[PDB]
Every structure is written in C-alpha cells, then in structure tokens.
C-alpha cells in the first residue's frame, strides 16, 4: 500500500509502506526523500494527527490515502 503526502508548499510525495508500517517510519522516509526536518514535519489524516509510534491500522488509514505534512513551527 502507498500513501500520498501533501506538503504545504505544493509538493506531492508517494511513499511505499506495508500494513505493518508505523508513523515514525514514514517521517524518516520523507527526510531521506526530500529533506523536510523530521523534528518539525507532522503526519495528518482526516484532520487527526497521526501520533508517532502507532501503526497505520490504528487510524483506519486506507490505501492511496491523502496524507498531510505540516511542520511544528516555532513560536516560543
């Protein structure tokens, strides 16, 4: 199964994962893919942010799902 990540810059990313993949893994893939800071980028689906550690089945993440990637940003 593959996922379509959407950056807030207008870039589409197609990643290849399994039914046993995890969020944390997706982030690393994107980092080695383009270079988006892992400590900033965050996975989102249906509005709900995918908590790092859990799998894709815990969020009913279907196939070819439209995932989003938003940075943590700084405002302290």
């Amino acid at each position: 199964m593959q996922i379509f990540v959407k950056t807030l810059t207008g870039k589409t990313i197609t990643l290849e994962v399994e039914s046993s993949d995890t969020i944390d893994n997706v982030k690393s893939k994107i980092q080695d893919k383009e270079g988006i800071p892992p400590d900033q980028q965050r996975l989102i689906f249906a509005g709900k942010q995918l908590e790092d550690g859990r799998t894709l089945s815990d969020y009913n993440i279907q196939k070819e799902s439209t995932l989003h990637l938003v940075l943590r940003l700084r405002g302290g």
Binding site: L8, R42, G47, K48, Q49, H68, V70, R72, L73, G75
Partner: protein, 43 residues
C-alpha cells in the same frame, strides 16, 4: 487566487470547514501552517 481565501480553501480540504479554518488563520495571523497547527493542537 486571493491568499486569504486560498488558505481557507486548502484547509477546507483536510478535515474541517472553511469557518473553522477562517478563525484559525486570522488568530494565528492569517498564517496557513499556523492555522493547521491550530486545528491540530488548539481546541
């Protein structure tokens, strides 16, 4: 298109209406990333 509406449009296609995205953006200072971050943490 207009930036103000452009942000609300992109945000409307994530999981929330244009209304929620509108308030989020404005307050966050019409910032897109901050808006999404609002719907993420801010509640």
């Amino acid at each position: 298109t207009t930036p103000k509406s452009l942000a609300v449009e992109e945000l409307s296609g994530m999981g929330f209406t244009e209304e929620e995205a509108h308030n989020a953006l404005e307050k966050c200072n019409w910032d897109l990333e901050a808006a999404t971050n609002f719907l993420l943490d801010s509640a």
